[PDB]
Amino acid sequence: ATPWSGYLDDVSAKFDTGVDNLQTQVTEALDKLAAKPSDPALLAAYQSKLSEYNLYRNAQSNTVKVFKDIDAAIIQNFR
Amino acid sequence: ATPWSGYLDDVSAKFDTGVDNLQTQVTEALDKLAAKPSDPALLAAYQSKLSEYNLYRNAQSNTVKVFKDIDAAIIQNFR
Amino acid sequence: ATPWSGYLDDVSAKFDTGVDNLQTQVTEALDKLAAKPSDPALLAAYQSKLSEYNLYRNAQSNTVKVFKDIDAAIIQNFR
Amino acid sequence: ATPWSGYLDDVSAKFDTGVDNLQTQVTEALDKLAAKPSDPALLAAYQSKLSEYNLYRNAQSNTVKVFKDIDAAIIQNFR
Amino acid sequence: ATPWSGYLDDVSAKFDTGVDNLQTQVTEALDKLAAKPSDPALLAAYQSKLSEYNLYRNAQSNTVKVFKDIDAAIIQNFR
Amino acid sequence: ATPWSGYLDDVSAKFDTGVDNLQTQVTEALDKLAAKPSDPALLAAYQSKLSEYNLYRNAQSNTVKVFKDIDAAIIQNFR
Amino acid sequence: ATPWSGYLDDVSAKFDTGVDNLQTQVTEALDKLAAKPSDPALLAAYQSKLSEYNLYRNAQSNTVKVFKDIDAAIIQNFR
Amino acid sequence: ATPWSGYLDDVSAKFDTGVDNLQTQVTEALDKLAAKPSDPALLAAYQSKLSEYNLYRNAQSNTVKVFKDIDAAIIQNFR
Amino acid sequence: ATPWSGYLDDVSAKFDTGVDNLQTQVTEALDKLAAKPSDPALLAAYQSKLSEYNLYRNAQSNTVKVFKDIDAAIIQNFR
Amino acid sequence: ATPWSGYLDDVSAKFDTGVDNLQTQVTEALDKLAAKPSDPALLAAYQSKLSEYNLYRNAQSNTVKVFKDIDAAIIQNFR
Amino acid sequence: ATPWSGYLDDVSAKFDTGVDNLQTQVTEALDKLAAKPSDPALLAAYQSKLSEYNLYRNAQSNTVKVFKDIDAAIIQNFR
Amino acid sequence: ATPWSGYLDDVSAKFDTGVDNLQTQVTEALDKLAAKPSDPALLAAYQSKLSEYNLYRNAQSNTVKVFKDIDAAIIQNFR
Amino acid sequence: ATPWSGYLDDVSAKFDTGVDNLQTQVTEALDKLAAKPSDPALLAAYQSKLSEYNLYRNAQSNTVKVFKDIDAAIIQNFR
Amino acid sequence: ATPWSGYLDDVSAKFDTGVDNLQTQVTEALDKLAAKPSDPALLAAYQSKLSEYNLYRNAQSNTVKVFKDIDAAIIQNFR
Amino acid sequence: ATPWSGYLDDVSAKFDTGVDNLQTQVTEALDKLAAKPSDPALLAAYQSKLSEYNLYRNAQSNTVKVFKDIDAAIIQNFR
Amino acid sequence: ATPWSGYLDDVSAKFDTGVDNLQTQVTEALDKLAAKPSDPALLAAYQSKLSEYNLYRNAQSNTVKVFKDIDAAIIQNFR
Amino acid sequence: ATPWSGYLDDVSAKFDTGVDNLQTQVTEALDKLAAKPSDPALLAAYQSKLSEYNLYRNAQSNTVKVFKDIDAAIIQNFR
Amino acid sequence: ATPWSGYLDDVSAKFDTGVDNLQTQVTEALDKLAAKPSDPALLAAYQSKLSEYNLYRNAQSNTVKVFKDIDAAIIQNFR
Amino acid sequence: ATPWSGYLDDVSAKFDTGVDNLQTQVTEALDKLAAKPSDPALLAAYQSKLSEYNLYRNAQSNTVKVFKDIDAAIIQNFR
Amino acid sequence: ATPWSGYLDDVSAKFDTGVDNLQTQVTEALDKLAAKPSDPALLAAYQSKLSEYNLYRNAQSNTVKVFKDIDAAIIQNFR
Amino acid sequence: ATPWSGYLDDVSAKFDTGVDNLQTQVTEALDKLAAKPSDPALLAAYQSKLSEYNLYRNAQSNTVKVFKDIDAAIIQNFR
Amino acid sequence: ATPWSGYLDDVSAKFDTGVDNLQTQVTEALDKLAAKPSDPALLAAYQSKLSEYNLYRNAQSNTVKVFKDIDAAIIQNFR
Amino acid sequence: ATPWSGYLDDVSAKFDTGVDNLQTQVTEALDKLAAKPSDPALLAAYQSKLSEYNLYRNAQSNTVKVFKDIDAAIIQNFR
Question: Whose CA is closest to G17, among F31, F44, H78?
Answer without folding.
Answer: F31
